[PDB]
Design a protein around this ligand. Structure first.
Ligand SMILES: Nc1ncnc2c1ncn2[C@@H]1O[C@H](COP(=O)(O)OP(=O)(O)O)[C@@H](O)[C@H]1O
Ligand SMILES: Nc1ncnc2c1ncn2[C@@H]1O[C@H](COP(=O)(O)OP(=O)(O)O)[C@@H](O)[C@H]1O
Ligand SMILES: [Mg+2]
Lengths: 487, 524
């Protein structure tokens, strides 16, 4: 059943994106989507979501499209409930907008069901009692700052450091190790950046036209008005919630950028007539992030694991928009430009990184102890690097020289050739298992691979590939030495 | 809730706030009372009255089923202030500010709006409250009825130190008379939902749910509940206080309560001031924390101890909400971010931290050792190539001892501190203090090897805890017997156990030494 289904109303007032609607038979509920049936002078349709009620017969709304050519007293009709978005495996491979209409010109979607955008966050009973590790198949992440099931994960990094490459690798590696799908919330993104993601995913075959796809794209770009850019984060989250709850699966979500959600709400909140809080943001800033980020969590049924980009405005970390977000996040991944330009990809600076589940209770004791020794050794190495610049390499102690040899190998072994980046690196990818990652790094700290050369560890995955490259280096070095032992 | 009379219809909604038009007759609801809005024929939606306008209109703060509220719906009144379920039957359960129980995976009521105890109603704080931390219980000792703030940055251990304080009570509460049991009330204001679940499981595994009730207003739930959550927490504690029993109240955290109250105030066009907060944001936390107190002998001698948590942004105490709560509470426990990453956990900055009623709050035994520690750490911090005095040696060992994950038992703490005071860990190196302390508590070296011959004093006998609290360590009954235990433990540890460190210069043994010493940091 569905009451108030096609209940007719008329447009009372139009001030920008904010639009009032008069209903004869009482106003619908809050968050109720309304289609504007009147007129064919527009090129695109108009859909209004009720945010407030003014009286029993009038309700204030926000426009998802532009409000151009909208006359007063124009016919408006309800949908039945909230804005409804398609879900299931028929969505995979396709691009969508905030409403759930296909924006890729590849026919109608197969949708067997539609779910509402504004779902409620899970109760206490639905939460997982096992904080569990989400094995990304990447050495720097899994060892030092492991992503957890249900986790909000944060991707800190400047322009052109490896963000889009890491998201694409996680979409591959979720689907390799857990068989999971992925969803990409293009929240307030550049429309031109959306094309490059769609093409690069088509080239790497995470999205496939003819065959199997393992990605969903939901884009609410800068050109769109604030109502869309605000609600588009939730649209993607509804699709990921279907794969979590119904299909019972480990799923990734990718919100670039979560600041643009908060900023989009800051525009509507101004137009709604609400008094701004600190630094000109909406007074419901903490509540807006609350209802969004709480839905992103590991239930008993499945697990959504959202990696997010967060813009820090004016490089001011004390600003409300990041500062409020920091409480919600589990694994902070920091990408450095100097690390990228030195040759280490992915460009993860492990000292500035951190994870909540880096704890003897959650992960194993052998995982924590090995992971701490990598962080400890790299901290000693940075102190020793300042001494070698001043004094010299020969001036160091006997034990400290061996720490440098291991620490140099640790920095090189933290690099990894990505499977999506075969075109860039010119070498096949490497999914490194959690058991492989812990054992290989453990042996390096012991000093079992002291006689193994340094460049063997650079851009490989796991100890078998290290010893394979070291064999190739021994053979090629034997040949070139024999050439100079002659001329 | 109990309906009475249909007072009006819903006119406007603006998220979590609404205004009503009165029904024919103009009955007029009472101020600060609950009202039930009929969202459907079967279901209701609660709300609190905040404004009674001249027009007849009534301002409402929405609480439940906010999505289901609509304009034109009927509104029933209670004609009563907000009362909630309180008592022993509410323990071991999760509950809203309104009183509804939350399901979790696998009782006479009390007014939330209540005045605090007056001048002659209270008394000086004498009963101690053990957090179970050597850093806190010596230097920043909390008394029963005291308000002790917890401040610091995100991920500095503000929740853990508050939750472990509740867990520390179970070992005492199980053994003692229930009259002196510390019943805990963890209020979770604006937190993530999974964080409440992990604390529920952590409280359940240590038997804390028996002596604890969890107030919960998560980030999904509205600002009206978050605003009211600490008030509902104290109400549940005041039951135990007014009926001559001692209680604990954790608010985690008042920063997010203030943000929820700011949302409410700003949405209702209340004039904002410093950092956009209303005029009465000080009054919000003041009337909350003053209801926590230590009552007189004339009114049972009960207590509500308060542990308000307040998040600071980049170690900035000059923020408006932080400075307000500092001026209300009886000192603070400051958690530094640099100490956290440096190693010290809990990261208690002793110089910044302070207890305004420390000396009178402490136990007679704990007062003996702790008075000296202030003198040693004062000289150690000032004096900190090398050159080691007796204070420099013994001072560094205290810093190693203060590191701990889970809370220490009063006997196991005070003996390991007494050892360091009289200088039993001087020959023992700084890295092997946790291995020395572990072998003192769980194992025992005198009974192991041979050279025991103590008549009563051992560490396996946990019941000596309460004899130590009565007589102290510096006393003719226990002094000679204790100094045997420590002399046997040091000589055997230095001879048999510390001899390995000169040995062990190989890869599978240095790593084995590390993994042993790492695990010793956790268990005290
Ligand atoms: N794993 C990797 N292996 C090799 N090259 C990489 C890797 N990650 C990033 N790069 C290089 O860094 C450049 C920028 O990375 P990209 O993620 O596209 O930046 P942005 O996220 O700003 O678009 C790419 O042109 C690519 O050559
Ligand atoms: N005494 C301690 N020893 C070791 N780890 C701790 C200790 N106290 C807290 N932690 C850890 O530090 C992290 C942050 O602690 P938490 O109390 O949640 O800080 P906050 O309340 O500021 O968020 C958690 O992962 C927790 O397990
Ligand atoms: Mg906390």
């Amino acid at each position: 059943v569905a009451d108030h289904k096609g209940r007719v109303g008329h447009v009372s007032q139009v001030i920008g994106a904010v639009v009032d609607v008069h209903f004869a038979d009482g106003v619908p509920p809050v968050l109720t989507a309304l289609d504007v049936v009147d007129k064919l002078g527009r090129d695109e349709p108009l859909t209004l979501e009720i945010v407030q009620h003014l009286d029993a017969h009038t309700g204030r709304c926000i426009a998802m499209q532009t409000t151009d050519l909208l006359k007063l007293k124009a016919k408006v009709v309800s949908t039945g409930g909230n804005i409804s978005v398609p879900v299931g495996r028929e969505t995979l491979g396709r691009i969508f907008n905030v409403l759930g209409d296909a924006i890729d010109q590849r026919g109608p979607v197969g949708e067997k069901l539609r779910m509402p955008i504004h779902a409620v966050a899970p109760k206490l009973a639905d939460q997982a009692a096992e904080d569990a590790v989400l094995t990304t198949g990447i050495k720097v992440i899994d060892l030092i700052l492991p992503y957890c099931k249900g986790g909000k994960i944060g991707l800190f990094g400047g322009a052109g450091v490896g963000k889009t490459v890491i998201i694409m690798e996680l979409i591959n590696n979720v689907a390799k190790g857990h068989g999971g799908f992925s969803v990409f919330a293009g929240v307030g993104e550049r429309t031109r950046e959306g094309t490059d993601l769609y093409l690069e995913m088509m080239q790497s075959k995470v999205i496939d036209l003819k065959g199997e796809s393992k990605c969903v794209l939901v884009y609410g770009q800068m050109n769109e008005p604030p109502g869309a850019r605000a609600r588009v984060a939730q649209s993607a989250l509804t699709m990921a919630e279907y794969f979590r709850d119904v299909e019972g699966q480990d799923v990734l979500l990718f919100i670039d950028n979560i600041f643009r959600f908060t900023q989009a709400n800051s525009e509507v909140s101004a137009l709604l007539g609400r008094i701004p809080a600190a630094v000109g943001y909406q007074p419901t800033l903490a509540e807006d992030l609350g209802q969004l980020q709480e839905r992103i969590t590991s239930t008993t049924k499945g697990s959504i694991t959202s990696v997010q980009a967060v813009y820090v405005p004016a490089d001011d970390i004390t600003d409300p928009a990041p500062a409020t977000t920091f409480s919600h996040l589990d694994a902070t991944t920091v990408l450095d430009r100097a690390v990228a330009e030195s040759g280490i990809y992915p460009a993860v600076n492990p000292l500035e990184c951190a994870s909540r589940i880096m704890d003897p209770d959650v992960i194993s004791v052998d995982h924590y102890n090995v992971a701490q020794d990598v962080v400890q050794m790299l901290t000693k190495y940075r102190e020793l690097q300042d001494i070698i610049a001043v004094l010299g390499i020969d001036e160091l102690s006997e034990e400290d020289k061996l720490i440098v040899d291991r620490a140099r190998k640790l920095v090189k072994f933290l690099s990894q050739p990505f499977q999506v980046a075969e075109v860039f690196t010119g070498m096949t990818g490497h999914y490194v298992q959690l058991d492989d990652t812990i054992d290989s790094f453990s042996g390096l700290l012991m000093g079992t691979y002291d006689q193994v050369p340094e460049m063997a560890f650079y851009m490989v995955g796991g100890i078998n590939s290290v010893l394979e490259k070291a064999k190739k280096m021994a053979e090629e070095a034997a040949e070139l030495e024999k050439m100079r032992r002659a001329r | 809730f109990k309906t009475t009379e249909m007072i009006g219809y819903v006119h406007s909604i603006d998220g979590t706030i609404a205004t009503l038009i009165p029904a024919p007759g103009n009955p007029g609801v009472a101020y600060n009372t609950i009202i039930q809005i009929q969202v459907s024929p079967t279901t209701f939606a609660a709300g609190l009255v905040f404004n009674l306008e001249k027009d007849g209109r009534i301002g409402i703060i929405l609480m439940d089923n906010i999505t289901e509220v609509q304009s034109g719906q009927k509104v029933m009144a209670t004609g009563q202030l907000l009362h909630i379920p309180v008592g022993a039957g509410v323990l071991g359960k999760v509950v809203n500010p309104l009183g509804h129980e939350v399901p979790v995976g696998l009782s006479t009521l009390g007014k939330v709006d209540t005045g605090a105890p007056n001048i002659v109603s209270r008394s000086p704080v004498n009963y101690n409250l053990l957090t179970g931390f050597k850093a806190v219980d010596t230097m920043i000792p909390i008394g029963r009825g005291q308000r002790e703030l917890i401040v610091g940055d995100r991920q500095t251990g503000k929740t853990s130190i508050a939750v472990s304080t509740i867990i520390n009570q179970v070992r005492i509460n199980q053994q003692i008379l229930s009259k002196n049991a510390v019943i805990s009330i963890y209020v979770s204001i604006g937190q993530r939902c999974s964080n409440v679940a992990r604390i529920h499981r952590l409280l359940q595994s240590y038997g804390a749910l028996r002596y604890t009730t969890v107030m919960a207003a998560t980030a999904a739930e509205p600002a009206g509940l978050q605003y009211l959550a600490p008030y509902a927490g104290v109400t549940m504690g005041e039951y135990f206080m007014n009926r001559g029993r001692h209680c604990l109240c954790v608010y985690d955290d008042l920063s997010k309560q203030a943000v929820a109250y700011r949302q409410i105030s700003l949405l209702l066009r209340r004039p904002p001031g410093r950092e956009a907060y209303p005029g009465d944001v000080f009054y919000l936390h003041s009337r909350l924390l003053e209801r926590a107190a230590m009552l007189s002998p004339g009114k049972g001698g009960g207590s509500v101890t308060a542990l308000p948590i307040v998040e600071t942004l980049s170690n900035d105490v000059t923020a408006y909400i932080v400075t307000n709560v500092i001026s209300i509470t009886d000192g603070q426990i400051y958690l530094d971010t640099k100490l956290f990453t440096g190693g010290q956990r809990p990261a208690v900055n002793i110089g910044l931290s302070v207890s305004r009623v420390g000396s009178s709050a402490q136990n007679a035994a704990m007062k003996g050792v702790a008075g000296k520690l202030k003198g040693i750490l004062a000289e150690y911090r000032k004096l900190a190539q090398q050159v080691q005095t007796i204070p420099m040696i013994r001072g560094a060992r205290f810093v190693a001892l203060f590191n701990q994950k889970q809370p220490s038992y009063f006997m196991n703490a005070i003996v390991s501190l007494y050892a360091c005071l009289n200088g039993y860990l001087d020959d023992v190196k700084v890295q092997y203090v946790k291995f020395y302390e572990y072998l003192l508590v769980h194992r025992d070296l005198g009974i192991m090897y041979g050279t025991a011959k103590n008549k009563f004093f051992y560490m396996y006998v946990q019941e000596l805890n309460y004899l130590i609290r009565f007589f102290t360590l510096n006393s003719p009954i226990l002094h000679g017997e204790l100094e045997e235990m420590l002399k046997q433990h040091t000589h055997l540890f230095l001879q048999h156990y510390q001899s390995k460190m000169n040995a062990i210069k190989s890869e599978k043994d240095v790593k084995a030494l590390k993994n042993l010493l790492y695990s010793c940091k956790r268990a005290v």
